[PDB]
Amino acid sequence: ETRMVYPVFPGETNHYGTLFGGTVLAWMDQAAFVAATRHARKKVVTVHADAVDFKRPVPLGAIVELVARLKEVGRTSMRVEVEMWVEPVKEGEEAYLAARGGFVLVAVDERGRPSPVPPLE
Amino acid sequence: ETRMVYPVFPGETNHYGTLFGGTVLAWMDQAAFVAATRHARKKVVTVHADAVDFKRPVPLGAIVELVARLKEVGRTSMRVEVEMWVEPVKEGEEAYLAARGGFVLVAVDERGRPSPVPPLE
Amino acid sequence: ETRMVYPVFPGETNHYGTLFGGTVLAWMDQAAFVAATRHARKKVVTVHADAVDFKRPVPLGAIVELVARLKEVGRTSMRVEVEMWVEPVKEGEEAYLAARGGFVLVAVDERGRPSPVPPLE
Amino acid sequence: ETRMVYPVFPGETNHYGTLFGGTVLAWMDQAAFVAATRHARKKVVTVHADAVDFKRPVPLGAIVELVARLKEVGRTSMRVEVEMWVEPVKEGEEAYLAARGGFVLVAVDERGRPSPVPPLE
Amino acid sequence: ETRMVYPVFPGETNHYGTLFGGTVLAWMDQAAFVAATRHARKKVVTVHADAVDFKRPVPLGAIVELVARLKEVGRTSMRVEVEMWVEPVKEGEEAYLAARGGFVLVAVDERGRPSPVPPLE
Amino acid sequence: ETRMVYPVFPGETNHYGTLFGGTVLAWMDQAAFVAATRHARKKVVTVHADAVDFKRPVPLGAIVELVARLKEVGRTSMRVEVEMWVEPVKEGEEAYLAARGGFVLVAVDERGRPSPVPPLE
Numbered sequence: 001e002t003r004m005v006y007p008v009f010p011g012e013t014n015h016y017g018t019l020f021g022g023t024v025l026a027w028m029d030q031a032a033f034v035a036a037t038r039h040a041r042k043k044v045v046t047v048h049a050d051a052v053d054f055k056r057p058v059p060l061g062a063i064v065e066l067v068a069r070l071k072e073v074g075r076t077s078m079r080v081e082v083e084m085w086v087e088p089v090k091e092g093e094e095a096y097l098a099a100r101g102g103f104v105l106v107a108v109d110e111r112g113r114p115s116p117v118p119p120l121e
Numbered sequence: 122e123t124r125m126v127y128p129v130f131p132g133e134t135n136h137y138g139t140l141f142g143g144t145v146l147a148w149m150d151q152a153a154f155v156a157a158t159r160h161a162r163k164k165v166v167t168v169h170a171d172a173v174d175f176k177r178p179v180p181l182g183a184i185v186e187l188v189a190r191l192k193e194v195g196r197t198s199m200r201v202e203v204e205m206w207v208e209p210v211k212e213g214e215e216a217y218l219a220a221r222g223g224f225v226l227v228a229v230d231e232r233g234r235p236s237p238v239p240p241l242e
Numbered sequence: 243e244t245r246m247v248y249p250v251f252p253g254e255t256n257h258y259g260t261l262f263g264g265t266v267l268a269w270m271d272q273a274a275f276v277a278a279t280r281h282a283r284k285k286v287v288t289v290h291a292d293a294v295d296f297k298r299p300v301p302l303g304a305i306v307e308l309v310a311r312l313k314e315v316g317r318t319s320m321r322v323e324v325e326m327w328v329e330p331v332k333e334g335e336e337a338y339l340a341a342r343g344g345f346v347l348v349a350v351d352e353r354g355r356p357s358p359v360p361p362l363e
Numbered sequence: 364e365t366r367m368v369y370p371v372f373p374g375e376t377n378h379y380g381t382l383f384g385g386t387v388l389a390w391m392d393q394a395a396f397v398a399a400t401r402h403a404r405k406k407v408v409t410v411h412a413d414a415v416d417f418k419r420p421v422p423l424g425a426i427v428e429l430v431a432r433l434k435e436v437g438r439t440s441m442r443v444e445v446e447m448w449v450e451p452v453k454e455g456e457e458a459y460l461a462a463r464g465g466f467v468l469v470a471v472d473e474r475g476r477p478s479p480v481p482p483l484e
Numbered sequence: 485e486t487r488m489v490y491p492v493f494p495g496e497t498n499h500y501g502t503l504f505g506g507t508v509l510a511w512m513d514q515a516a517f518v519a520a521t522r523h524a525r526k527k528v529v530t531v532h533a534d535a536v537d538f539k540r541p542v543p544l545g546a547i548v549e550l551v552a553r554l555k556e557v558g559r560t561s562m563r564v565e566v567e568m569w570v571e572p573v574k575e576g577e578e579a580y581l582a583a584r585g586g587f588v589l590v591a592v593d594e595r596g597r598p599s600p601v602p603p604l605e
Numbered sequence: 606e607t608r609m610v611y612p613v614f615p616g617e618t619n620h621y622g623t624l625f626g627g628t629v630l631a632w633m634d635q636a637a638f639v640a641a642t643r644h645a646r647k648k649v650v651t652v653h654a655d656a657v658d659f660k661r662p663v664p665l666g667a668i669v670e671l672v673a674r675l676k677e678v679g680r681t682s683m684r685v686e687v688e689m690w691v692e693p694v695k696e697g698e699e700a701y702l703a704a705r706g707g708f709v710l711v712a713v714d715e716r717g718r719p720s721p722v723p724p725l726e
């Protein structure tokens with residue numbers, strides 16, 4: 001698993017005071033990029049993203065955790081699922097899934113051509 | 122038809138010298154956010170993204186243009202397609218589609234509740 | 243014409259909750275940079291800026307549109323006028339000019355020396 | 364155990380092509396802020412930082428991982444140690460500690476007054 | 485006499501490896517904003533900018549210093565001149581003016597109405 | 606002395622509306638980096654930071670001044686003390702020290718090896 005936690009500050013929000021969607025997309029892609037690089041052990045690029053759902057808003061000041069997991073491997077491509085959870089700090093409240101999405105990354109050689117990646121296990 | 126043009130500087134690239142995918146996603150979402158806002162004439166939020174394909178890399182120093190177009194409207198939701206073209210500077214040089222994706226946005230009232238939007242004209 | 247639209251988020255504002263002036267200047271220059279590159283079909287640099295007027299404040303959450311237009315051409319230099327309009331979203335309200343300014347850009351060769359640009363039409 | 368992983372892109376480097384020290388410090392503080400927040404279950408602020416050592420440089424394109432661990436607890440204060448490791452991509456390649464530092468954070472009430480935190484378990 | 489010094493890193497450059505003009509403009513405005521604020525002892529806004537000349541390029545890795553000086557005062561307005569010098573590191577190396585511009589700022593009350601400022605001493 | 610002034614905008618704050626600690630650390634390091642480069646007259650890197658104390662919060666909209674001063678010199682290393690003062694604008698209020706810290710920088714040759722710096726005076 002690949003994890004990244006972020007406090008949500010004003011600079012990452014929209015005018016409503018919630019985490020901007022473009023920002024969550026960038027963080028998820030970064031997370032997928034890291035998980036894919038770890039598996040392929042070489043340079044990778046994002047080629048596709050699908051089914052990204054923004055289920056619940058992320059308020060200013062929330063702590064969110066991104067978790068990326070390799071779901072399947074083809075030959076040079078990898079599909080990574082990324083989830084974003086907001087973890088409440090005040091006792092009582094519980095963590096909830098704010099967003100989730102899938103990304104397909106491709107490993108490439110120094111020439112930039114698709115390169116084979118190890119199978120998953 | 123919403124349009125945004127950006128010069129690609131070092132700050133928006135990955136370590137390969139090409140436009141980082143996360144930045145591409147954020148710019149597209151922002152494009153769709155503006156297009157949806159103008160059609161709904163209300164506050165809008167991104168609820169879904171799908172079929173985002175990164176066909177060709179965008180080199181450092183490229184001039185990129187994002188074009189967002191409203192494709193369909195439901196009741197409170199709108200599907201916007203966003204394309205990203207790199208517009209070569211050199212005379213007679215190319216001009217190609219680098220990426221494209223779809224986003225679904227929902228208009229909401231001041232209470233944050235989904236609100237209906239005008240029909241697709 | 244060269245156009246760019248931006249939603250105004252907290253990260254681009256000053257402590258008053260309005261678009262920071264330094265940010266509008268950077269966006270206008272970027273717009274002029276793009277319009278000039280498109281005309282010259284080569285690398286350009288900003289050499290001068292004049293008469294930038296900030297007529298009305300741009301509130302947090304506003305949608306602004308930047309429009310850059312080539313106004314005159316010398317030999318290697320180009321003068322581009324940039325306007326920034328805020329486009330209200332709520333029915334009733336109308337668009338207003340928030341700021342406007344002029345920029346002079348110069349095309350340069352690979353050696354960094356001023357290079358001739360096509361005349362305007 | 365709080366963890367954050369980041370790819371090192373041009374935007375976070377100094378003119379040498381290595382991760383800028385100021386960015387390292389900001390990421391560590393952010394790591395400690397999250398770890399302290401989760402333990403205190405309250406709003407927290409950084410009051411002190413010490414013994415931050417930059418042992419090895421982090422090259423552009425490296426994958427870095429920050430790990431924050433609560434080391435000791437007083438009454439309202441917590442000392443968190445943060446380490447930053449670069450995780451090589453190449454097969455059989457290295458894996459080293461690039462930096463480490465300690466931060467002291469204090470939990471505060473909504474009034475901004477220091478509040479006690481749970482004991483160290 | 486307001487002063488700000490900045491190291492020029494990749495994140496603030498254009499694709500040529502020199503300090504981006506938009507960033508220069510934002511830094512100058514910020515310099516003038518601070519100088520005007522200290523003289524007016526009130527909230528201030530930028531209303532006009534003129535005669536900004538980019539005389540020499542600022543290479544990646546340069547140390548730049550901005551100096552803002554109050555030149556004249558009207559009733560509620562102030563004209564501040566901002567200069568940007570690159571301070572070479574190498575022994576006996578140069579030291580030159582890279583850019584200069586003028587900004588006009590206006591002090592305003594909490595209502596946002598122009599307020600008078602002290603005379604120029 | 607090396608000085609840098611900054612207005613505190615939303616983008617540099619935490620969710621409490623005060624200057625984020627990670628940001629003050631980055632600004633102090635930048636300040637130390639500049640002061641050290643000026644003394645060594647060559648490339649430098651941050652190797653150590655100690656005793657950074659955050660004494661008082663810095664509110665949104667405050668003007669802060671960073672002052673870096675070379676305190677001692679070894680052979681290739683330099684210790685710089687950095688202070689951050691907030692300078693009130695409204696008559697009556699006075700400036701106060703918000704934070705202070707020490708940094709050790711090392712000059713290096715083109716090969717990246719520690720290089721001797723002139724003694725202090």
Ligand SMILES: CC(C)(COP(=O)(O)OP(=O)(O)OC[C@H]1O[C@@H](n2cnc3c(N)ncnc32)[C@H](O)[C@@H]1OP(=O)(O)O)[C@@H](O)C(=O)NCCC(=O)NCCS
Binds near residue numbers: 045114135177
């Ligand atoms: C990545 C790239 C080189 C692939 O080009 P290509 O001609 O499709 O290469 P191939 O046809 O050999 O396909 C390579 C792999 O990617 C997969 N793939 C390519 N396009 C895809 C798409 N849009 N959706 C899903 N998978 C895709 C293929 O299925 C194949 O997987 P496999 O080897 O497991 O079978 C090209 O699409 C590209 O350069 N895109 C831009 C990448 C980028 O700039 N990203 C943003 C910056 S991080």
Ligand SMILES: CC(C)(COP(=O)(O)OP(=O)(O)OC[C@H]1O[C@@H](n2cnc3c(N)ncnc32)[C@H](O)[C@@H]1OP(=O)(O)O)[C@@H](O)C(=O)NCCC(=O)NCCS
Binds near residue numbers: 018021169196197233
């Ligand atoms: C939509 C939301 C506000 C609550 O409503 P909901 O119960 O999820 O959805 P509703 O049943 O109210 O339906 C709202 C509309 O969105 C559509 N919708 C909701 N979830 C969707 C998804 N994952 N994919 C596609 N469309 C979706 C519905 O089909 C409906 O469209 P319609 O009115 O045209 O028929 C909630 O998803 C939300 O707050 N999400 C977070 C948004 C956000 O923070 N985004 C990033 C910040 S910009």
Ligand SMILES: CC(C)(COP(=O)(O)OP(=O)(O)OC[C@H]1O[C@@H](n2cnc3c(N)ncnc32)[C@H](O)[C@@H]1OP(=O)(O)O)[C@@H](O)C(=O)NCCC(=O)NCCS
Binds near residue numbers: 718
């Ligand atoms: C800077 C670096 C090359 C020094 O390595 P080194 O093996 O310690 O080198 P040396 O042992 O010759 O020490 C060089 C000097 O640094 C000082 N120094 C080294 N480590 C130190 C530490 N953690 N605390 C204080 N001073 C330290 C030494 O005392 C010596 O000073 P002196 O010449 O005045 O006596 C190495 O630590 C490094 O590359 N660190 C990463 C720097 C970086 O990436 N910073 C962030 C980006 S700006």
Ligand SMILES: CC(C)(COP(=O)(O)OP(=O)(O)OC[C@H]1O[C@@H](n2cnc3c(N)ncnc32)[C@H](O)[C@@H]1OP(=O)(O)O)[C@@H](O)C(=O)NCCC(=O)NCCS
Binds near residue numbers: 409660
């Ligand atoms: C702590 C603060 C809130 C006021 O309290 P204070 O009078 O300084 O400290 P207190 O006497 O109330 O003690 C609070 C705790 O912090 C600790 N502390 C305070 N100053 C410290 C320092 N410089 N080094 C180490 N610990 C320190 C105390 O030991 C005490 O710990 P304990 O309860 O476990 O025994 C004040 O320092 C503050 O507001 N600082 C600015 C914080 C900030 O803006 N940081 C950056 C933004 S995230």
Ligand SMILES: CC(C)(COP(=O)(O)OP(=O)(O)OC[C@H]1O[C@@H](n2cnc3c(N)ncnc32)[C@H](O)[C@@H]1OP(=O)(O)O)[C@@H](O)C(=O)NCCC(=O)NCCS
Binds near residue numbers: 289537
């Ligand atoms: C652009 C630059 C090379 C021009 O230098 P120069 O010695 O003035 O070159 P020239 O005298 O040949 O003038 C070139 C053109 O620029 C115009 N120009 C130069 N300085 C100007 C100024 N301050 N105001 C308006 N136009 C100006 C000239 O009129 C001429 O236009 P023309 O060919 O249509 O007649 C030099 O000023 C420079 O490098 N500046 C820094 C650019 C930069 O870093 N910008 C920020 C980063 S994008």
Ligand SMILES: CC(C)(COP(=O)(O)OP(=O)(O)OC[C@H]1O[C@@H](n2cnc3c(N)ncnc32)[C@H](O)[C@@H]1OP(=O)(O)O)[C@@H](O)C(=O)NCCC(=O)NCCS
Binds near residue numbers: 298530559561590
């Ligand atoms: C100034 C403003 C507040 C409304 O006042 P106004 O009607 O434009 O100007 P006023 O007639 O009230 O005069 C105010 C002062 O500004 C000066 N001024 C206004 N427009 C100016 C311009 N374009 N050029 C030079 N000075 C100008 C006036 O000469 C006067 O100076 P004085 O009192 O010393 O004689 C309005 O221009 C404003 O809100 N602009 C937007 C500011 C902003 O958002 N900037 C970017 C964010 S920091």
